[PDB]
Amino acid sequence: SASEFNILNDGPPKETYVVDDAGVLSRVTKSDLKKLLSDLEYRKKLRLNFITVRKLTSKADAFEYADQVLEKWYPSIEEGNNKGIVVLITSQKEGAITGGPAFIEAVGENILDATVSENLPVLATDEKYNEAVYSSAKRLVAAIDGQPDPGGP
Numbered sequence: 032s033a034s035e036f037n038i039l040n041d042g043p044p045k046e047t048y049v050v051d052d053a054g055v056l057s058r059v060t061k062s063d064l065k066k067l068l069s070d071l072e073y074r075k076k077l078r079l080n081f082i083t084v085r086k087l088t089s090k091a092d093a094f095e096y097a098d099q100v101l102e103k104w105y106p107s108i109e110e111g112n113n114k115g116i117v118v119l120i121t122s123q124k125e126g127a128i129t130g131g132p133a134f135i136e137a138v139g140e141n142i143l144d145a146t147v148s149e150n151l152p153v154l155a156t157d158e159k160y161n162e163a164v165y166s167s168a169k170r171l172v173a174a175i176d177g178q179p180d181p182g183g184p
């Protein structure tokens with residue numbers, strides 16, 4: 032699909048932290064994401080990007096595609112070490128999260144697995160894409176900052 036290709040092709044958003052290809056997020060929430068994530072990057076030197084896509088032309092799943100984006104956008108560990116990539120496939124109500132070792136290590140498997148099995152699928156099923164993405168961003172940030180886990184929906 033032009034979507035699957037564009038997302039890969041266009042590379043990472045170095046000004047915004049979001050590629051809303053499915054167009055399911057409001058400009059206000061995208062502004063709030065940029066603020067939250069630009070602050071995370073300033074403080075912890077971790078660059079977390081969110082990607083929304085309606086459907087994947089290929090048969091690959093969310094995690095497979097997330098990994099494909101990580102490797103294409105950041106083709107070396109020097110570039111990808113502190114990078115995190117969250118994918119949300121809106122039609123499937125499925126999410127995935129991948130990243131470099133430093134990013135993965137900072138979040139922890141507990142929160143990584145919880146965000147993808149709770150916040151993302153649950154909120155998107157209820158058509159709350161803005162909350163799905165922003166609550167996930169908040170939950171991952173809390174894990175990174177060693178703060179109390181806000182929990183899922």
Ligand SMILES: [Ca+2]
Pocket residue numbers: 034052053054083084085086
């Ligand atoms: Ca799309």
